[PDB]
Design an enzyme around this catalytic site. Structure first.
Site, short mmCIF file in Angstrom:
data_model
loop_
_atom_site.label_atom_id
_atom_site.label_comp_id
_atom_site.label_asym_id
_atom_site.label_seq_id
_atom_site.Cartn_x
_atom_site.Cartn_y
_atom_site.Cartn_z
N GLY A 114 0.83 -1.19 0.00
CA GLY A 114 0.00 0.00 0.00
C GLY A 114 0.88 1.25 0.00
N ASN A 138 -2.90 -0.67 -5.33
CA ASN A 138 -4.07 -1.12 -6.07
C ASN A 138 -4.51 -0.04 -7.06
OD1 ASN A 138 -5.08 0.56 -4.06
ND2 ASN A 138 -6.81 -0.76 -3.52
N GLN A 142 -1.40 5.74 -9.05
CA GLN A 142 -0.28 5.77 -8.12
C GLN A 142 0.95 5.11 -8.75
OE1 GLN A 142 -1.83 4.27 -4.37
NE2 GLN A 142 -2.46 6.36 -3.81
N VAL A 165 -3.66 -6.34 -2.73
CA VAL A 165 -2.77 -7.15 -1.90
C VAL A 165 -3.47 -8.42 -1.41
CG1 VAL A 165 -3.13 -6.14 0.40
CG2 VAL A 165 -0.91 -7.15 -0.18
N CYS A 310 -9.39 16.51 7.73
CA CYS A 310 -8.28 17.15 8.42
C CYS A 310 -8.71 17.78 9.74
CB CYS A 310 -7.63 18.20 7.53
SG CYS A 310 -6.76 17.45 6.14
C1 LIG Z 1 -3.31 5.53 4.40
S1 LIG Z 1 -2.70 5.19 2.76
C2 LIG Z 1 -0.93 5.04 3.12
C3 LIG Z 1 -0.15 5.24 1.84
C4 LIG Z 1 1.36 5.20 2.05
N1 LIG Z 1 1.78 3.99 2.83
C5 LIG Z 1 1.80 6.46 2.80
O1 LIG Z 1 2.27 6.29 3.94
O2 LIG Z 1 1.64 7.59 2.22
C6 LIG Z 1 -3.11 3.42 2.59
C7 LIG Z 1 -2.90 2.93 1.16
O3 LIG Z 1 -3.25 1.53 1.04
C8 LIG Z 1 -3.80 1.33 -0.24
N2 LIG Z 1 -4.60 0.10 -0.23
C9 LIG Z 1 -5.78 -0.09 0.45
N3 LIG Z 1 -6.27 -1.29 0.29
C10 LIG Z 1 -5.37 -1.94 -0.54
C11 LIG Z 1 -5.34 -3.24 -1.09
N4 LIG Z 1 -6.27 -4.17 -0.83
N5 LIG Z 1 -4.30 -3.56 -1.89
C12 LIG Z 1 -3.35 -2.64 -2.12
N6 LIG Z 1 -3.28 -1.39 -1.65
C13 LIG Z 1 -4.33 -1.08 -0.88
C14 LIG Z 1 -4.62 2.59 -0.51
O4 LIG Z 1 -4.83 2.76 -1.90
C15 LIG Z 1 -3.70 3.66 0.07
O5 LIG Z 1 -2.77 4.06 -0.92
#
Ligand SMILES: C[S@@+](CC[C@H](N)C(=O)[O-])C[C@H]1O[C@@H](n2cnc3c(N)ncnc32)[C@H](O)[C@@H]1O
Ligand SMILES: C[S@@+](CC[C@H](N)C(=O)[O-])C[C@H]1O[C@@H](n2cnc3c(N)ncnc32)[C@H](O)[C@@H]1O
Ligand SMILES: COc1ccc(C[C@@H]2c3cc(O)c(OC)cc3CCN2C)cc1O
Ligand SMILES: COc1ccc(C[C@@H]2c3cc(O)c(OC)cc3CCN2C)cc1O
Lengths: 335, 335
Positions: A114, A138, A142, A165, A310
């Site tokens: 993610g 996903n 991105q 994932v 926010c």
């Molecule tokens: C809170 S954001 C954190 C993003 C990054 N780790 C950061 O710190 O900026 C969580 C991320 O998980 C991704 N995500 C959520 N469910 C997912 C899945 N099933 N498979 C892959 N990515 C996923 C979302 O698209 C998002 O980009």
């Protein structure tokens, strides 16, 4: 006064910041009342019931994200040393903190689950030229953003897996797996941790960072009909806030080595910086969004949602000087 | 006022109960100040430091024990439903609680590690005639006491291993392993849990009960020179009080399934009952002990030690209505 009425005033920008903050703070206050039990005996009964229940279970243009978030568009709690630390500095400090605590070393294979807009992936790839760094996301937008940034920064050690994932199947293993504020979105945590372990060898480490409450767990959803906020921010039942210790009960397949929390004022300063930057860039943001959204009204809606997120995040993470909701971090090896 | 002087008055019975209670309460109060940190960030840093440090690491006649303790000479926290529950009733309720939480069923092989005078072994053997029940103890007198009681109660399903558990080598496995307030004496916990796992199959369960503090861990030893109590009660560095969650960090070889705590007033009522019964039987106790101890002075010393242990235990476990020191229980399966 009904939800509809508050949501009405909110969308019209008729609720001033002070009142908005007060309303959201009250909502979080009620969550604290719901979550704290009178005795440790009852607290653990409540917490274990939550853990047991778990075991049975349009994208914004990048120009907009750049106008609201910091330089690497980090979408997770940052780390502020000083009151004058900028969001760009706090992003970098956060990246460094993760590298220290996950024991990143030059030459390792690294997977970031993610990875979002890839701030951490790019940070590691630049700082450790002999590491190969894989982000998994996903989101096609991105992936494309990260690959473009890698090209611009002359990074040759970056790849991105486009996958859900929970569906991704591979026999590839990694020296290091990082999960930064992604686990909160995982419907099946025991299954998630099991899958991660299959991507590890005996030499690997897994580092997880997640928003938490220090004492109890909860889904991010309305307790009652007075709560207009939770379902506005997350219109799906898709976000879980684990307690700071919840993951200790998910060691079927991995074993804990270290455990920390970062006080919630860091998160509060993060969302405050995003809110202020969006406010500063408000006119530009509305212009960027208009093409893809179709009307000024739909634009205002997306902006209201993000800004309220926010404002609400501020009240949540700053509550009791950062000592209620905060960020938990854990380091594991494979069983 | 020096240790020597307080210890002098104590041995002479010149400290009244009220003053004694007040002094010991103060000592525990200082431990609370030592253990509670200002932020959850600091609390976890302190707790993980303790856990990491762990990972680098004449018998009383039975007539005397019978005059001081309850009917089965249980030497662990009991469970009091009512204010009028007797120590004999509380022993039985405690035994039943363990059987429920460890999921004991007729027909299982059961091992009780550090079985003491065998109250739990005898309880299970009597209630479940098809279980085979093994107690393990490092005390020859305890083994002999248990085998005699089994004979008197017409129990044919009891055996006792005489061993230091840390030295005991066997390939035998058991459906159920119980460890009731024994782990507090274990110098090497990671090693202890590993060994237990080798005595389990995939169908086994491990149930552990230990005195705890709800928030932090500590060795049972003096913080400072004002603490005459800790080293009086345990003249060796031999007792560790784990936090209620400490064992969650020892899942290398076993995996948690459930977790409870029992409020400390149960323990407080336990030691209170022992103290009152000893006081009632004081004349008899002194007569029983005299032969084996040699002088009335040595007798008084042993009695002072036991009675003070009870008086101090009262203050410790009753502190803040049972919400500081208490009993933790955990259920595990093998990895
Ligand atoms: C809170 S954001 C954190 C993003 C990054 N780790 C950061 O710190 O900026 C969580 C991320 O998980 C991704 N995500 C959520 N469910 C997912 C899945 N099933 N498979 C892959 N990515 C996923 C979302 O698209 C998002 O980009
Ligand atoms: C607090 S008593 C609990 C006794 C019993 N479980 C009960 O609940 O009454 C702890 C017991 O562990 C035993 N013990 C301590 N260290 C031991 C060791 N290394 N091997 C075997 N037994 C041990 C002590 O002799 C004592 O009987
Ligand atoms: C971890 O909880 C969350 C997970 C994902 C989101 C959405 C995600 C996000 C996540 C954050 O944790 C966050 O900083 C708090 C900011 C943002 C910006 C929007 N972006 C799409 C919000 C959450 O509150
Ligand atoms: C678990 O800590 C302890 C372990 C062993 C002992 C000694 C042991 C004992 C243990 C207890 O937990 C207890 O009830 C509290 C009473 C007694 C009576 C004396 N007997 C020999 C004291 C402890 O305080």
């Amino acid at each position: 006064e009904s939800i509809g009425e508050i949501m009405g005033k909110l969308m019209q920008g008729e609720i001033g910041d002070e009142e908005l903050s007060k309303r959201i703070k009250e909502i979080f206050g009620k969550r604290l009342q719901w979550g704290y039990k009178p005795t440790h005996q009852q607290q653990l009964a409540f917490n274990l019931d939550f853990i047991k229940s778990l075991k049975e279970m349009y994208e914004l243009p990048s120009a907009f994200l750049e106008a609201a978030f910091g330089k690497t568009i980090k979408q997770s709690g940052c780390y502020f040393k000083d009151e004058t630390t900028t969001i760009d500095e706090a992003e970098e400090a956060s990246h460094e903190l993760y590298c220290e605590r996950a024991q990143i070393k030059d030459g390792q294979t690294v997977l970031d689950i993610g990875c979002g807009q890839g701030g951490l992936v790019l940070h590691i790839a630049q700082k450790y030229k002999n590491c190969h760094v894989t982000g998994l996301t996903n989101s096609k937008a991105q992936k494309n953003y990260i690959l473009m940034q890698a090209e611009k920064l002359q990074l040759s050690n970056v790849d991105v897996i486009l996958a859900d994932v929970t569906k991704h199947e591979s026999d590839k293993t990694y020296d290091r797996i990082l999960v930064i504020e992604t686990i909160e979105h995982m419907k099946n945590i025991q299954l998630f941790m099991k899958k991660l372990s299959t991507w590890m060898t005996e030499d690997s480490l897994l580092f997880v960072d997640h928003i938490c409450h220090k004492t109890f767990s909860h889904h991010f959803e309305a307790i009652d009909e007075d709560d207009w906020y939770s379902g506005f921010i997350f219109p799906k039942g898709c976000v879980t806030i684990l307690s700071a210790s919840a993951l200790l009960y998910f060691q079927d397949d991995v074993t804990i080595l270290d455990h920390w929390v970062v006080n919630g004022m860091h998160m509060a300063r993060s969302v405050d910086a995003w809110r202020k930057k969006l406010d500063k860039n408000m006119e530009l943001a509305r212009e960027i969004l208009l093409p893809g959204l179709g009307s000024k009204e739909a634009v205002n809606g997306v902006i209201t949602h993000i800004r309220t997120f926010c404002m609400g995040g501020y009240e949540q993470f700053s509550y009791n000087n950062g000592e209620e909701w905060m960020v938990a971090q854990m380091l594991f090896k494979k069983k």
